[PDB]
Amino acid sequence: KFPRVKNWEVGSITYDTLSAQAQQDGPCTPRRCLGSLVFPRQLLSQARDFINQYYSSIKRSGSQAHEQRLQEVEAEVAATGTYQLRESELVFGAKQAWRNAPRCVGRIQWGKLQVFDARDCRSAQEMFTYICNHIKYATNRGNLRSAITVFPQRCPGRGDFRIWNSQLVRYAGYRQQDGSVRGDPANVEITELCIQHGWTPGNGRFDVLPLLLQAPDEPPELFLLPPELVLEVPLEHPTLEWFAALGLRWYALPAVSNMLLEIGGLEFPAAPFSGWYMSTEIGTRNLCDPHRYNILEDVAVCMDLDTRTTSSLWKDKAAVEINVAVLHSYQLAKVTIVDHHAATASFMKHLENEQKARGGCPADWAWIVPPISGSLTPVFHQEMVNYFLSPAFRYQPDPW
Amino acid sequence: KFPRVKNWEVGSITYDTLSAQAQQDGPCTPRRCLGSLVFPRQLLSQARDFINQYYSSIKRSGSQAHEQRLQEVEAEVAATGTYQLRESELVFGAKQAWRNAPRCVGRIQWGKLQVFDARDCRSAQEMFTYICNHIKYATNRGNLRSAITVFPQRCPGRGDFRIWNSQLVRYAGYRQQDGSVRGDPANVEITELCIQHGWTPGNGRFDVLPLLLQAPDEPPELFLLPPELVLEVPLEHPTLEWFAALGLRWYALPAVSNMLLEIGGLEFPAAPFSGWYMSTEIGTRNLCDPHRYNILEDVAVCMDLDTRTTSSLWKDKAAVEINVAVLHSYQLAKVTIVDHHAATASFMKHLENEQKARGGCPADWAWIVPPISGSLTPVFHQEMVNYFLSPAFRYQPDPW
Ligand code: HEM
Ligand code: HEM
Ligand SMILES: C[C@H](O)[C@H](O)[C@H]1CNc2nc(N)[nH]c(=O)c2N1
Ligand SMILES: C[C@H](O)[C@H](O)[C@H]1CNc2nc(N)[nH]c(=O)c2N1
Ligand SMILES: N=C(NO)NCCC[C@H](N)C(=O)O
Ligand SMILES: N=C(NO)NCCC[C@H](N)C(=O)O
Ligand SMILES: [Zn+2]
């Protein structure tokens, strides 16, 4: 079964021959589709497959080298219950994990990833060092560079290395007596965990949280990022002179730190990664979602729009100007950022590159299509096939 | 398996116990999800089930009446290869077909549908009469009322009744010598079929096509809607005084006429239905799709936006004003129209009503979510389960 995939804008069609090699762990069946679900989910066999992928990538499949690596991997597994990846294999796997991520619209840059090997890490203190270096390299004074830092793999009879925060840089969410929240509502739990672990909080709306880092079988320890390491952008609007007076801002580096990296059957519970922002992520979701900063009303009011009726599309106008504020501000502060039109246009290219490369691309339509102006971007008119290939980035339960 | 369905805005969760009774004819499998695909696809057993649904609806399940109807249906089928529905059964089935439509955001009104029985239809001439009547009742001078006209079912050894047009009112699409299209490009084929059947075309941008109606085993015949019957809205903007000068307009009645209605195993190849418009359908899709009227550029330019770069979000700003044009124009002309915020908000209520009623609701996230401001509407933050229940409206091959 090679699903026909059609682009309704140009009428072109392709056949996804790659899906037939995916993992049968999706939530859909012939009876019902569960694709809108946020959470849709032998070591030897997985390892062998990954080793095979690796040798094919360097074009040395079937070589003595390939054979040796297979026997070696099997020996380690049969002898220890796990195995050790080689440095180049790790770099290869990390890049495929990103490449394979169905929900990522920035995958055309997949081959340009900087992997930091942090597998000889021994303490949360060293963990903090590796993280500060990651933030330094990646942030790069605003000319952001994609990177990932891989900490020790999951071990037989050993606790995991875990970063409790969901992102390396997050704003505190302080729940008020009156039920409101000062800061980011999405971060109330982690904020309260930091406080409960000894952190003295700061009553601000954009207070960068400390890191709660965990080494195998240890309580988590608190670590404060130096202000100098955390680049932020103050928000202003090119024409709405009053926007700036709102005192809004956002950090430069989106670094996801709560997902698990799986390469050839091996699991790395702590393996932070980051690229750069796509405007809708901040402008639409972070700032306009009712349970996030929730600023639409104030902005609409300041724009003096008719908030009385829904047909005035006050919400649409405010949202758009806020996304404009984010783009303008990042470009001003000279911090890397890409808008949804450019982002999706590049993904259409990535899809083309992959059809020629692997004969298909795992994509999640609901996440690829932007939270605003969906039909105005080319991906909306593009049919997609969603599946789970490996290596991969996966979700995992919170460590507490 | 009762899929848990969560609303990420409020955090509430439900379990769809209705999907377990769906038809296993969807395109997804545990290996891959084909939910973004536009086209995802015994009479006795189907009939009995429908009859059972009907008797449950009137609360007379297990009655002598229920039993008689079962035996009767079976006798007709065993005797003729088909069977005839009763008027009340037809009315009930048509309403369930709408209710079951996963891609319809206007389903909260499902119970207020006016079914017109046109099953005694004998010619294309009479077919044209019922259509004009449908247009009159439904249009209702601008206070649109949802309705459907059911023409004779598909028969053993007999051609079908078919309406060649996709909608009752469509604008011609005239392909120009220079490769351009004057009118609606989506209607080039039907336009050329009309011409090919004797229609003398009209080189305009908004020329209402004639109907190409087909009666069993007949060539299609052309029929011209009297201008009087087709209500249209000229488009203007509340503030952009020049918008009107663009000479844009759209018809009031969206009446889909190419879909098949399936009730208890019976198929009605001709059974046009209509409700009223949701603004995004016209403003975003019909007017902004690159292969539709494609007016973004011109409007952006007239709004004097920086068309130079994508980060100015010129496309987003024009699109919003155009949707504003549509809404304001229909409200001015006093023609029924609903905006995406109101539409999606009503669907959230429909979902709640159905959870209580049938323990679930078949919905296609990709279609329920509007083509603009997706995350600004509550449906975006709502997980959905998509499946195919019966009765239903289905797609079918074009009759030529
Ligand atoms: C190159 C610049 C990048 C851009 C513009 C980008 C953009 C995006 C966007 C818009 C999403 C949708 C998720 C959301 O709405 O929160 C996403 C998801 C994702 N990105 Fe990419 N990304 C970039 C780089 C990377 C890199 C370097 C990796 C890993 C090596 C990565 C891994 C992922 C994963 C795993 C997801 C899914 C996250 C989830 O499921 O919550 N991204 N990205
Ligand atoms: C009552 C006012 C109504 C509103 C506001 C409404 C709105 C919508 C919208 C926004 C869509 C998305 C499809 C598209 O973008 O073309 C849709 C689809 C659909 N509507 Fe509803 N509709 C209404 C009434 C009806 C009625 C009365 C029926 C049948 C009795 C119906 C049957 C359908 C079907 C079958 C689809 C899917 C069409 C397709 O798959 O191409 N609608 N409607
Ligand atoms: C339920 C639904 O899938 C969920 O709200 C999704 C939809 N698409 C998304 N797409 C992106 N990029 N980011 C998100 O957080 C979401 N949320
Ligand atoms: C490929 C893609 O699914 C297709 O363009 C869909 C997306 N969602 C849609 N949603 C609605 N309401 N109407 C449409 O025509 C479409 N088209
Ligand atoms: N671009 C990335 N990662 O590198 N996106 C991941 C999610 C980020 C999230 N939407 C935020 O803005 O907080
Ligand atoms: N409301 C309905 N049907 O009743 N919508 C579906 C058809 C409308 C179609 N998208 C058009 O505007 O051409
Ligand atoms: Zn699916």
Contact call for B372 and A316, based on CB within 8 A = yes
A27–B316 CB contact, under 8 Å: no
Other CB atoms within 10 A of residue A70 CB: 16
CA of A105 to the centre of ligand 1 (A): 7
State the residue for tokens 């796990």. A82
CA-to-CA dists, residue A294 to A198, A219, A307, A317, B125, angstroms: 29, 34, 15, 15, 58
Out of B32, B38, B324, the one facing A387 most closely (by C-beta) is B32
Structure solved via:
X-ray
Determine whether the shortest distance from the Cβ of A105 to ligand 1 is under 6 A: yes
Ligand 5 neighbours by CB, cut-off 6 Å: A 167, 254, 256, 274-275, 277, 281-282, 285-286
Measured between alpha carbons, how far is A344 from B251 in angstroms, rounded to an integer? 32
Q: In whole angstroms, what is the distance from residue B391 CA to residue B98 CA?
A: 8
Tokens of A303: 């724009």
Which ligand 2 atom is nearest residue B101's CA? 35
- Chain-centre distance of CA A194, in angstroms? 22
Task: Flag whether A281 is marked binding.
Answer: yes
B35–A365 CB contact, under 8 Å: yes
Retrieve residue A326's tokens: 């984010």
Q: Which amino acid is at A273?
A: F
Please name the member of A288, A319, A365 whose beta carbon is closest to the beta carbon of B366: A365
Please check whether residue B86 is in contact with residue B54, taking contact to mean a CB–CB distance below 8 angstroms. Answer: no
Ligand closest to B37 (CA) is: 4
Task: Say which DSSP state A52 is in.
Answer: H
Q: What are phi and psi of B203, to 5 degrees?
A: 35, 35
The minimum CA-CA distance between A23 and chain B, rounded to whole Å, is 6
Pairwise CA distance, residues B100 & B21, whole Å: 13
Ligand 5 atom nearest the C-alpha of A277 is 1
Q: Which of A216, A213, A262, A210 is nearest to A122 (CA)?
A: A216
- Which tokens go with B200? 């003398």
* Interface contact A316-B323, CB threshold 8 A: yes
Check the annotation: does A380 bind a ligand.
Answer: yes
**Active-site residue A281, yes or no?**
yes
Asked whether the beta carbons of residue A373 and residue B319 sit closer than 8 angstroms, the reply is: yes
Q: Residue B370 CA: which ligand is closest?
A: 4
Long-range contacts of B136-139 (CB under 8 A, 24+ apart): B136/B229, B138/B114, B138/B253, B138/B255, B138/B274, B139/B229, B139/B231, B139/B252, B139/B253
Helix-strand-coil split of chain A, %, nearest 5: 40, 15, 45
**CA distances, B240 to each of B247, B278, B339 (Å):** 14, 22, 20
Q: Angle at Cα A334 formed by Cα B303 and Cα A375, nearest 5°?
A: 40
Is B283 touching ligand 6 by the criterion CB < 6 Å?
A: no
Phi, psi angles (nearest 5°) of residue B314: -65, -40
Chain A closest CA to B123's CA: distance in Å?
A: 36
A123 CA: distance to closest CA in chain B (Å):
36
Q: How far apart are CA B198 and CA B201, in angstroms?
A: 9
Probe site for chain B from A5, A6, A14, A31 (most B CB atoms < 10 A): A31
Q: DSSP 3-state assignment of A338?
A: strand
Burial class from Cβ neighbours inside 10 Å (0-12, 13-18, 19+) for residue A386 reads buried
Q: Does the distance separating the beta carbons of A324 and B320 come in below 8 Å?
A: no
Residue A288: DSSP 8-state: H
Ligand 4 nearest-atom number relative to CA B105: 12
Cα–Cα distance, A97 to A256 (Å, whole number) = 14
Nearest residue to B323 via CA among B385, B389, B237: B237
Comparing C-alpha atoms, which of B342, B326, B231 is closest to residue B284?
B326
Of ligand 2's atoms, which has the minimum distance to the CA of residue B281? 15
Contact B332, B344 (CB under 8 A): no
Query: Parallel, antiparallel, or unpaired: how do β-strands A392-394 and A260-263 relate?
Result: antiparallel
Catalytic (active site) residue B89: no
Residue with CA closest to ligand 2 atom 43: B104
Model resolution, angstroms: 2.4
Distance to chain B for A227, nearest Cα, Å:
29
Q: Which atom of ligand 4 is nearest to the CA of A384?
A: 1
- Cα A391 to Cα A388: distance, rounded to the nearest angstrom: 9
- The two tokens of residue A186 are 């999405």
- Quick one: which ligand is closest to A278's CA? 1
A7 alpha carbon to ligand 7 midpoint, in Å?
A: 18
- Residue in chain A nearest B380 by alpha carbon: A371
Rounded to 10 degrees, the C-alpha dihedral A119/A226/A220/A94 comes to -30
Yes or no: say if B102 and B364 are a contact pair by the CB < 8 Å rule. yes
Q: What is the DSSP letter of A33?
A: B
| B319 neighbourhood in chain A, CB within 8 Å | 373, 376
Query: In the beta sheet, which residues pair with residue B234?
Result: B249
Q: Residues B376, B344: contact at Cβ < 8 Å?
A: no
Give the one of B24, B316, B327 whose C-beta lies nearest to A373's C-beta: B316
Cα–Cα distance for residue pair A48/A69, rounded to 1 Å: 9
- Is A129 touching ligand 1 by the criterion CB < 6 Å? no
Distance from CA of A371 to the nearest CA of B (A): 5
CA nearest ligand 1 atom 5, residue: A106
Query: Alpha-carbon distance A108 to A338, whole Å?
Result: 13
Alpha-carbon torsion (A393, A397, B3, B7), positive or negative? negative
A107: annotated active-site residue: yes
Among A103, A113, A137, A253, the mutation site with the greatest number of ligand 1 atoms within 8 A of its Cβ is: A103
Domains and CATH numbers, chain A: 16-119+146-156+260-274+344-368 (3.90.340.10), 120-145+160-231+395-399 (3.90.440.10), 232-254+277-342 (3.90.1230.10)
Entry field: residues in chain B: 400
B141 belongs to the catalytic site = no
**Residue by residue, what is the 3-state secondary structure of chain B?**
CCCEEEECCCCCEEECCCHHHCECCCCCCCCCECCCCCCCCCHHHHHHHHHHHHHHHCCCCCCHHHHHHHHHHHHHHHHHCCCCCCHHHHHHHHHHHHHCCCCCCCHHHCCCCEEEECCCCCCHHHHHHHHHHHHHHHHHHHCCCCEEEECCCCCCCCCCCEECCCECCCECEEECCCCCEEECHHHHHHHHHHHHCCCCCCCCCCCECCEEEECCCCCCEEECCCCCCCCEEECCCCCCCCCHHHCCEEECCCEECCCEEEECCEEECCCCEECCEEHHHHHHHHHHCCCCCCCHHHHHHHHCCCCCCHHHCHHHHHHHHHHHHHHHHHHHCCCCEECHHHHHHHHHHHHHHHHHHHCCCECCHHHHCCCCCHHHCHHHHECCEECECCCEEECCCCCC
Gap from CA of A372 to ligand 1 centroid (Å)? 17
How remote is the CA of residue A36 from the centroid of ligand 3, in Å? 8
Distance CA B149, CA B137 (A): 11
| Cα–chain center distance at B298 | 29
- Ligand number nearest to the C-alpha of A38: 3
Is B104 part of any known ligand binding site? yes
B286 lines ligand 6 (CB under 6 A): yes
Tell me how far apart the alpha carbons of residues B39 and B18 are, in angstroms, rounded to a whole number. 23
Considering only CA atoms, which of A259, A327, A270, A307 is closest in space to residue A149?
Answer: A270
* CA A53-A55-A56 angle, 5° bins: 65
DSSP letter at A147 equals: E
Q: Which residue has the tokens 């609606």?
A: B184
- A99 Cα–ligand 1 center, Å: 10
Ligand 7 (ion): residues with CB under 5 Å are A 28, 33, 35; B 28, 33, 35
Three-state SS at A97: helix
